[PDB]
Amino acid sequence: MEYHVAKTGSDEGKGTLKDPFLTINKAASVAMAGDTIIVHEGVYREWVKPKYKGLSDKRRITYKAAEGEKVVIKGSERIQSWQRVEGNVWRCQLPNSFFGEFNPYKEEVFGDWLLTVNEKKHLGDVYLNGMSFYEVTNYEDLFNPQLRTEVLDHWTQKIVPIKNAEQTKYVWYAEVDREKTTIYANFQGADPNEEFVEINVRRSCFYPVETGIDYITVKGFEMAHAATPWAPPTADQPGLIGPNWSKGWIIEDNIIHDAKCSAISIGKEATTGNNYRSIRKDKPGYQYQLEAVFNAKRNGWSKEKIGSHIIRNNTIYDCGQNAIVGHLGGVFSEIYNNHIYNIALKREFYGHEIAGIKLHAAIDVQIHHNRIHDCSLGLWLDWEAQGTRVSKNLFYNNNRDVFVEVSHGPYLVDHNILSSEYAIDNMSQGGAYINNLIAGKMNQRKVLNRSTQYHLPHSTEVAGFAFVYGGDDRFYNNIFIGKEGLENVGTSHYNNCTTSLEEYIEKVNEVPGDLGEFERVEQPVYINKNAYFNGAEPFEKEKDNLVKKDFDPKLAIIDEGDEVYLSLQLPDEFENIVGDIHSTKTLERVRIVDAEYESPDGKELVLDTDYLDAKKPENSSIGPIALLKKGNNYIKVW
Amino acid sequence: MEYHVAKTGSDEGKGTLKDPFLTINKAASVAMAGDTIIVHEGVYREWVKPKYKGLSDKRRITYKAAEGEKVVIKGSERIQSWQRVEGNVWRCQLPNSFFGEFNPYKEEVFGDWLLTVNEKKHLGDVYLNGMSFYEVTNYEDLFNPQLRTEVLDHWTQKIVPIKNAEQTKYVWYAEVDREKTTIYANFQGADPNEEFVEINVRRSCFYPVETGIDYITVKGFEMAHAATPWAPPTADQPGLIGPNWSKGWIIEDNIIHDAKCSAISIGKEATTGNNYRSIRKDKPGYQYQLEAVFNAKRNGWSKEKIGSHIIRNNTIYDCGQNAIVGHLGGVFSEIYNNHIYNIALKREFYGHEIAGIKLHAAIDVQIHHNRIHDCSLGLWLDWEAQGTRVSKNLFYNNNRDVFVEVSHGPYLVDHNILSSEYAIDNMSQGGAYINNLIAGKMNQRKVLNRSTQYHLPHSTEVAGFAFVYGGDDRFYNNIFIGKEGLENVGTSHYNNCTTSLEEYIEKVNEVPGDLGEFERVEQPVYINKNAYFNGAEPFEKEKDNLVKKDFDPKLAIIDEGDEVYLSLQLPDEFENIVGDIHSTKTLERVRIVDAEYESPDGKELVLDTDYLDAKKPENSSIGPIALLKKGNNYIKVW
Amino acid sequence: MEYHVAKTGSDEGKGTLKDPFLTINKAASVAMAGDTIIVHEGVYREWVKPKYKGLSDKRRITYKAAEGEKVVIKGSERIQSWQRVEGNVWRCQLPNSFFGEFNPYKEEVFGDWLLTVNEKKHLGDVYLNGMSFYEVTNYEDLFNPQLRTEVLDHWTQKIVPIKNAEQTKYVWYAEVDREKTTIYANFQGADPNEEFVEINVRRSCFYPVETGIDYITVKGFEMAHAATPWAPPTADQPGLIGPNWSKGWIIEDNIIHDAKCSAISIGKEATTGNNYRSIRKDKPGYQYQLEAVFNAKRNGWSKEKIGSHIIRNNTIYDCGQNAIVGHLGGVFSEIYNNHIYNIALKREFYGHEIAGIKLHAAIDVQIHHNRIHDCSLGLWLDWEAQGTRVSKNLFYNNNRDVFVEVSHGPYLVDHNILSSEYAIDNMSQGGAYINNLIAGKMNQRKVLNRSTQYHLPHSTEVAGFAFVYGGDDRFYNNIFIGKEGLENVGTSHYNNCTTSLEEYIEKVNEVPGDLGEFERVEQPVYINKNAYFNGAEPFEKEKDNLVKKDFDPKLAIIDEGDEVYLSLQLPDEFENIVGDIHSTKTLERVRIVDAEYESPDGKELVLDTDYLDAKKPENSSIGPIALLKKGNNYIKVW
Numbered sequence A, B, C: 001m002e003y004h005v006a007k008t009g010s011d012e013g014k015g016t017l018k019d020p021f022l023t024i025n026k027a028a029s030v031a032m033a034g035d036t037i038i039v040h041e042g043v044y045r046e047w048v049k050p051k052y053k054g055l056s057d058k059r060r061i062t063y064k065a066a067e068g069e070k071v072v073i074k075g076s077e078r079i080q081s082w083q084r085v086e087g088n089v090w091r092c093q094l095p096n097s098f099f100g101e102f103n104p105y106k107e108e109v110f111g112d113w114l115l116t117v118n119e120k121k122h123l124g125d126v127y128l129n130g131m132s133f134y135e136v137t138n139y140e141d142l143f144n145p146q147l148r149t150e151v152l153d154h155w156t157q158k159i160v161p162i163k164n165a166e167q168t169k170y171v172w173y174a175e176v177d178r179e180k181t182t183i184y185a186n187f188q189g190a191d192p193n194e195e196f197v198e199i200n201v202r203r204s205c206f207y208p209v210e211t212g213i214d215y216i217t218v219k220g221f222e223m224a225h226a227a228t229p230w231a232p233p234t235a236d237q238p239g240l241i242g243p244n245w246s247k248g249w250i251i252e253d254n255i256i257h258d259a260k261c262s263a264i265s266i267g268k269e270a271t272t273g274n275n276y277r278s279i280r281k282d283k284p285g286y287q288y289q290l291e292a293v294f295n296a297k298r299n300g301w302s303k304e305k306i307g308s309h310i311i312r313n314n315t316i317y318d319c320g321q322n323a324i325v326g327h328l329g330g331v332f333s334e335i336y337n338n339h340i341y342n343i344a345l346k347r348e349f350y351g352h353e354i355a356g357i358k359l360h361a362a363i364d365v366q367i368h369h370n371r372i373h374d375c376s377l378g379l380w381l382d383w384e385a386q387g388t389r390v391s392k393n394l395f396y397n398n399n400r401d402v403f404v405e406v407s408h409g410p411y412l413v414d415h416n417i418l419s420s421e422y423a424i425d426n427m428s429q430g431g432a433y434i435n436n437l438i439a440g441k442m443n444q445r446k447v448l449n450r451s452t453q454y455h456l457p458h459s460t461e462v463a464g465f466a467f468v469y470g471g472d473d474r475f476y477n478n479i480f481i482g483k484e485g486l487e488n489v490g491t492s493h494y495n496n497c498t499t500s501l502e503e504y505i506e507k508v509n510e511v512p513g514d515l516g517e518f519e520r521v522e523q524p525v526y527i528n529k530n531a532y533f534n535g536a537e538p539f540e541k542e543k544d545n546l547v548k549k550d551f552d553p554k555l556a557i558i559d560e561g562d563e564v565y566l567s568l569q570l571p572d573e574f575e576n577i578v579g580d581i582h583s584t585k586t587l588e589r590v591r592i593v594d595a596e597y598e599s600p601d602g603k604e605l606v607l608d609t610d611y612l613d614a615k616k617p618e619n620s621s622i623g624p625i626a627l628l629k630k631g632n633n634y635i636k637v638w
C-alpha cells in the first residue's frame, strides 16, 4: 500500500492519494511490511512512532517526502502568547499538560560522564526565526546578557572564537511548578509574537517506542527541534531520529538540526544499563559499561538482530552532543556522503560523549566520504572499534579531527584528509593509517587501568578483553605536515617501539616468564613511505621516508559552500617517494586480537582507490589523492 | 529507606512516616534496592509502575499495606455525572483525554485464539456497588435486557446454571468518537449517582513499564478493576499485576479481583511476538508460538534472568480470562496457598486461553496447596510442562479441573483432590499421576500434527521438540470414582499400550527401520495399585488393583466458606490395597525427553507426605490422605 | 617456513628443501600458521594428522604436491605374502598389531539408517592393480563367484546394468581372531604376489584427530584406499579427508577415490551424537537428529567457528557412500568445478545416506559448476537446505539427479542440466527452480510426521521448526522434457495449489480458527514461462507457457572423456517465450521461514549469468543456456 499524508487530509480518511491522512503518525500506526508513506508539503509538529516492522530489506516500510516537496518534522511549537515583562524580556506560560510526561524545561542534561555539574542545564530551547538561544541559570541573568566573542574549548584548553557571537545575547530561563511552566527569554528588541518564535516540546521526531522495529527507510525530510537527553554508552540513548535497537534502517537525504544532544542515534536502550554509576554510585561508568556489553549479548546483540544500518546523504548540524551517536546499536552499519558541522559549538554543557560522530563498539562500521567540519571533535571511536574503517573523509576546522580510544583493532584510517591542528587522539592499539594527509598533531598514550573487550572477527561474540599497551600501529604512505609552534606531528611518538612482531617476540622471550616479560617490551610499529614537511617528525627507525622540515606546503582547505577545494604546494622530492597498494597481504595482523585487516565479508581488502575514487597502480604518489604532484595543486575535494 | 504513603501525605514531601507521600506511584518512582514502601489505609486509584529494580532476594524492594490497615489499589474511577436517558438506562460522557492513550471503551478483547469473533467485546466495565455488568452490542439491547439463568459451557458443550442470574440484567454499552467517550448502562432502578458506581479506566494496577524490574515484593493489598487485554502466549501478556519479564517477585497476601482478562501475569512481553497470526495472517499461532520460544531464548530467557517468582496466600476471583496467566515468564516459579474462584463464569467472550491458572512453558513450576473451584477450567499447562509439579491441590465445582496439553514431561500430579465430573484433559505424554483422588473422566488424546519443545533438565535450554504419541504416563495409588452414565473414568484409555520401556524397545526393534517402526508401537504405561469405584474402569493389564464398580463412595466436598470438608465412604476392601512411597527411584524415566522425576535442584524426590502434609510409611492407604480408611470419612481439607 | 617432504628425506632432518623430512605426518606435527608443506614425488602410505591450526585465511597452513610432481597418499599397504589355498583363492595373514586400534576387517559398515542388516559388510577391501573387490559372507563363496551383469537399484527398484561386470568375479573374505587377521581372495588366475595387490589398512588419509584445526589448504594430491565408516547425520562422520569440525579449509586439485563409504567429509563429530538410535534403541534417528542440532549449537556450531570450507577442482570417484558428505560441518561452504562419478555403484551395502554429494544443514552452501554422473543419486540435501544454491551443474547418467528433503528453503536450483529419467525427489517446500533443463520426472511429496528446523537468515541460529506441507515452490524458465511411458515430468504436481500468497491468506482466513484452517488450504506456487515437451505436463493455472506434447527434443549428453556435449532439438516456437531475469525482487518470499532469496552476504541476488557463465540479456530465451535456439543445438557443456 502507498499511503499519503497531506495538510489537506484527514486521519479519518483512507490514506490514499485522493483521500490522504492528516498526520504522519496516523500512517505510522497502520503501515506494514512493504508499504510506503508519502508525505506532502508542510510542517508536521509531532513525534512519529513506527508501529510495525519491515521484514527484510526487500519488504521494508518507507517514509519519504513527496517528490519536490518541502516536508519538515519538528519537535517544537510556535509560541505566540508572549507577554513583555520588562526591557527586552518576555514570558509565556503553559499548563504542564502541554508537555505531558516529558517536560523539556523540567528534564536536565544529566548522566554518566557529564562534567558540567554545578550549572544545571535543561533540554528545552527557544528559537527566534530559527536561531536557538543560550540558557541562563537565574531570572536576573535574563535582563542584561553580555555579548561573548570567545570561548574555552574544554579538551584542548584553548580560547577560541565563538562562531556566532550575536547569538550569545539571546538567553532563556524557565520555571516549572506543579501546574505550569513559565518560560522567559530576552528577544533583544524583537516582538516574539510577531517574529517566528518556537520552543522545544517533544523529545524526538522519528523514533519507535518499541525495540525491534526493523527495516525502516526514512528519506528526504528536514527534521529539527528535539529535546534529546545526554546520551552516554551506559544509558538509554534516544536521539531526534534513530532505530531504537533494531536492524536495517536507511536514513537518507534528510537535513537534521537542532537536537539538544544527539541527532541520529544508533545506540542502545535502557534495559542493558541506565546511568547506574550516576544513580547507584557504587561503581564507575567504566565498570558498568563493560557490563552493559554482556547484558546486551544476553539480550541478543548480534549481526542477526541489531545494526546493519545505513546513514547516507544527510546534512546534520547545530546539535549539542553529536550529529551521530551510539553504543552497540550501530554494529555493521555504514555512514557515508554526510555533511556534518557545527556540533557542540555553543558549549552550554560538556562531558565525554561529544563529537560530530561518536560510536562505541563500531564493529565493522564503514565511515566514508563524509565532510565534517566546525566541531569540537569530528569523530570519536570509543571501545571496540574492531574492523572499523574510516576512509576518504574530509575533516577541517575542527578543534580535533579524530579520536580512537581504548580499542585494539584491527581498525583502519585510510585516504582521509585530516587537516585540523590537532588531528589525532590515539589511545588505542591495532591501527593502520594508510595514504592520509595529516596536518595536525597526534597525542598517543597507553591505557593501563582500563581493560576493554575484543571480539571474534565480523561478530559481536566476545573473544577477550585487554588494556592498551600502546603501539601495534601501522603508518604507510601518509603526508604529515607540521606547523611552527605545533609539537608531535608525525610518527616520532613510537621511537621506543620494536619494528616487527618477530623482534617483539624474540625480545620478550629472552628470559622465561609470563605477563611481566611481555609488559617490559614495547609493541611493534610498521612504518614506511611517509613524508614529513614543515616540522613533522618521523619515527627514528623508519627505513624509507621523505623529510623536508623547512618546506611549507601552505595547505589550505577552501570552503565555498557546496564545494570545497584543497590547495597545497609539494616539493620536487615528492616525485621520488612512491607508495605501495596496501591490502590484507601487506598489513601485519594486530597482536592481541590476532586478526587481519579485511573486508566485512571476511574477504581480502585491497586499498587501491584514492580519496577521489580513482584506481591507482602499484607505484603511485603517497597521500590521499593520486593526482597530487610536485608544485602547485588545487583540487576539488567536495 | 522506609517510605510511607498515606492519604494525608504530599508528593512534595519527604516520604517519611511523619511526612508521607500521597500516591504509591510517587514512592515507586524513588524507591531503590533494599527500600520498603508502607502504604496506609485508603483507596488508591492509580497504576503503580515500579521504577528501579531490587538487586537480590536480600535487597528487594518491598511494597506493602501498613499493619492492620485496609489498602486498595483500583484501576477504576467512580462516576457521578450520570443522566437518565429513559427507563432504567442512564449515560455519562467523558473526554477521551480522561483515558490517555489506553481507552477501555475503544480497546477490544482481541487476538490469537480468541474464538468469539462475531460479537465484539471491549476492555471496559461498569460496576454497581462492586458488581460488574454484561456488555451489550447495540444501543437497543440496553433498555429491556433479558434475565438469563443458564449458559453454555463452551468446551464441554453442557448447559449449566449461571451463578449470579440477577447480574445478567445489568448491561452497558459505549461509543467513542474523536473527542468523547459515552457510556450507557441499565441500572435496573437504582440511581447511579447515589449508589457507588465505577467504570474501568486503567489497564493495570501494579505493573512495571520496563522489563527487568526484578525482586519486588507486593504484599497485603486488595487490587481490583483492571482493563486487561486478551493474553495469548503469542502476544504481550499484561495483567492487573505482574513482573513484566523479570525475576524474583513475591506476590502474597493480596485480594485480587475484577481483571477484565488475566489478574496476575507472569507471562511474556511484546518483543518476542505480538499476535502475528491475527495481524499478518500468514502462519498459524501454532507456528508463531514455537518461534517466540526461540526469540525469547535470544532475548535472555533463562533461569539467571527470568522467573523464580512466588505467588502465595492470595485470593483471586471474578476475572474473565485467568487468575494467573503466563507464557515463558513463569519458569521456576512457585504458586501455593492461593484461593482461586469464579474465573470466566460470565462468558462474555471465549477462546483457548481461559482457566483459573494457565501457564505455557511452566518449567519446574511448583503448584501446590491451592483451592480452585467454580472455574470453567481450573488449571491448564500448555506446552513445555517439564519438571512441573501439581501437588496437594483442592479442585472442585469446576466444569473441568486439569488440562495438560502438548507436553512431554516429566510432569507430576500428586496428592491432589480432583473432584469435578470432567477431571482431566490429557493431550500429553510423560506424566506421573500419584496418590490422587480423581472423581471425573479423563479425555486422553494424541497430538500428531503439532510438535513442541522439550528442554535440558532444570533449564530453558532447548533439547529438541516432539509430537505427542500418547501414553508414557504413570498412574499409582490413585482412587478413581465414576458416576452413572459418565464414561472414561479410570485408566482403560491405555489398553493398547506396552507395559515397560523394555517391552516397547523389543517390539520396535523386531524389524529393522527408523521412525516408521517406532510409530507402529504404543508407548508404555506404568500403572499399579489404583482403586476404581462406581463405574471407573482400569487399564486391563494393571497387575494390582481394587475394582468395585458397584461401590458408591458418595463423595462430597462441603464448602463452608473458610473451611472445606471432604465426605467419603470407602469399602472394607480399601484396607487390603496399600501403596508404595514413590520417588525418582521408582518412576521410570520419560522416553522422548529421557529425564527423571526429580526436585528442581536436581536431587532425588520422595513423595512421602500426603495432602495434609503427614509423613507416611512405606505401606500406606492409597489416595491423597493417609487418614482415609474403610467406612465413613469426614475430613477437613481446607 | 616452507617445509619439504621427499622420499630421500629423513624425519630427523630439518625439513628444508636441501634436508627434507621423509613423511608428511612429520611435517604435519611441526607446521604452524602461515607455513607451507611441499611434498615431492612418491607414494606416502600414512594417515596425515594436521596438528596445529591455521589462524586466518591469510595465515593458513598449506599442504601441496611439488609442482609437476605426482604425489599419492594411500590408506592401504601392498601385500606380497599371499599363499594359494585352492584354485584361484589365495590367503595372507597379518598380526592384529598391524592395524592397531582400527582393524578394517573387524569394523563393520554399521549404524543409523543402514538398511542392509542381514549381510554384514566390513570396512576392508582388496585391490588388484587398483581394482577393488566385492566382499563375500562365507568362506565357501570364494571359490566359484558368479559373474553378475545387472543389479537392482534400491530406490528406483529398477534392475540396471552393472558398469564393470567383470569386477563382480573378484571377491574377498576375512577372519579376525585374538591374534591374527586372515584375508582370502579370488584373483581369478593372477598371481597376487606378482601383480600389484593392496588391502585397506587405515581409516583416513588426511584428517585431524582433534577438532578446530582451521584454515588448512590441501592441494594437488591423489588420495586413495580409506576404510571410512558409514556416516549418518546422527554419528561421527569421518572421511578419507576432511576438516573434522573446523573452519576455512580449501580442498582443491586432488584426485580422490576408493573411500569405503564417504571420501570428503565436512560433517560433524561424535560428541553431539553417535548412533544413539542404533545403540540405545529407545528413540528413532529422526528424534536424535533434531537433538544433535541443538547439541552442536551449544558446542559452538556457528559461522564464527564452523564451515566456510571450499572444495574445488577435484575428481572424486569409486566411493561406497558419497564423494562429499556432511551434517552441520559444511555450513556456508562452496563446492565447485568438481568431477564426481561412480558413487555407490557396487551396492555392497545400502541405506539412506548414499549420494554423490549428501549434505544436511547445508546453510547458504553454494554448489555450482560440478559434473556429476554415474551415481545412484547425484545430490541429496537433507534437512535445513536454507539459502542453499545449486547452480550451473551437469547431471547425467544417474539413477536420480537431485533430492531435496524436509527443507523449508529459501533454496535455489538454477541453470542446471538435470538430464536423468528420475530428475527430482522434492520432499520440501520453499524452493525456486529457475532456468533449468529438466529431462526426467519429479516425485513431490508432503512430510507431515517429521518436523525440522529452519533458521534466521545467514546464520545457524534456530528460528523454528516445521512440517513440509508441500508447495510454496517457484518454477520459471525451465525446459521440461518427458519420455514415453514416463510419468510426472513437469509441474502438474501442483494442480491443487493456490497461485499467490495473497490468495492463500484470503482463503485461509475465510473462516476463523488457527492451525486447522491453515492446514485445509494448499500453499501457493509461482509458476510461469516454462516449456513442456514430449509428454511433460504443466501446472494447469500457469499463465504463459509452451506445451508441445508431440515434439521430441532427442536430448543426449555425449561424454567424450574430458569434454562433454549437449545435443538438443528445439521447436520453432522456442524463441517465442521470453524469460525474465530473476532476483530477490522477483522471487516471492517463502511462507514459513518468511525469508527472501538473497546472496550469502545478505544482499540482493540477481541470476543474470547462465550455465556457460554468459551475461544474460533482459529478454532472454529460457532454459540454462541463452544461446539455445530453435533447431539443432550441439554445445560443449564441459
Ligand SMILES: O[C@@H]1[C@@H](O)[C@H](O[C@@H]2CO[C@@H](O)[C@H](O)[C@H]2O)OC[C@H]1O
Pocket: A113, A232, A233, A286, A289, A352, A353, A382, A383, A405, A406
Ligand atoms: O567509556 C567511555 C570512555 O572511554 C571515554 O572517556 C575517556 C576516559 O575518561 C576520561 O577521563 C577521558 O578523558 C576520556 O577520553 O568517554 C566516556 C565513555 O564514553
Ligand SMILES: O[C@@H]1[C@@H](O)[C@H](O[C@@H]2CO[C@@H](O)[C@H](O)[C@H]2O)OC[C@H]1O
Pocket: B113, B232, B233, B285, B286, B289, B352, B353, B382, B383, B405, B406
Ligand atoms: O498453543 C496453545 C494451544 O496448545 C492451545 O490450543 C489447543 C489446540 O487448539 C485447539 O483446537 C485445542 O482445543 C486447544 O486445546 O491453546 C492455544 C495456544 O495457547
Ligand SMILES: O[C@@H]1[C@@H](O)[C@H](O[C@@H]2CO[C@@H](O)[C@H](O)[C@H]2O)OC[C@H]1O
Pocket: C113, C232, C233, C285, C286, C289, C352, C353, C382, C383, C405, C406
Ligand atoms: O534424517 C535423514 C532423513 O530425512 C533421510 O531419510 C528419509 C526419510 O526416511 C526414509 O523413509 C526416506 O526414504 C528418506 O528419504 O535420510 C535419513 C537421514 O539422513
